[PDB]
Write a protein that binds this ligand. Structure first.
Ligand SMILES: O=C(Nc1nncs1)c1ccccc1F
Length: 163
């Protein structure tokens, strides 16, 4: 079984009327939930406006994120994986022979790409061996940076969030 941390979604922006039960009934549409909790004040029991759900598998987390936007008890909520929320990555280690279609063909399966920038030397024009990829949504980046490995154009790449 995949590590539990990788099967969790934090859910922000909840209606204060959302309960453990109503959050569960909503998100069980996309997989088996092993946990589902609304965070509440310890004294008033008033909702803190966020909670988390834990799916049985990572593919179920993906299904839930692919079904955004989620309207839960009348309010559009904000699900995020286990936050520095950005849409852009640095990709290093691609050397000189890696081209845009290499990066596109690989990264398009994580999310919709809006910008690919292969970095070149300001003086010579030679490729510097790294690039930036911008997606239309942060979950692409979140899926990417939790992978242990990225292989693009036969190169073992270093990938990190870019600010
Ligand atoms: O910015 C991109 N490529 C180029 N950048 N300079 C010339 S063409 C790009 C954007 C979205 C999807 C695929 C892409 F390649």
């Amino acid at each position: 079984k995949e590590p539990e941390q990788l099967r969790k979604l934090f859910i922000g922006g909840l209606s204060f009327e959302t309960t453990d039960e109503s959050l569960r009934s909503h998100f069980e549409q996309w997989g088996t939930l092993t946990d589902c909790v609304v965070m509440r004040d310890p004294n008033t029991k008033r909702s803190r406006g966020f909670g988390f759900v834990t799916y049985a598998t990572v593919e179920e987390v993906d299904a839930a994120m692919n079904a955004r936007p989620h309207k839960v008890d009348g309010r559009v909520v904000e699900p995020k994986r286990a936050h520095l929320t950005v849409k852009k990555i640095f990709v290093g280690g691609i050397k000189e022979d890696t081209e845009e279609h290499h990066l596109r063909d690989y990264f398009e399966q994580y999310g919709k790409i809006e910008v690919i920038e292969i970095m070149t030397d300001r003086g010579s024009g030679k490729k510097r061996g790294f690039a930036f990829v911008t997606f239309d949504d942060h979950d692409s980046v979140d899926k990417i940076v939790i992978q242990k490995y990225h292989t693009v154009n036969g190169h073992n790449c270093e990938v990190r969030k870019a600010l």
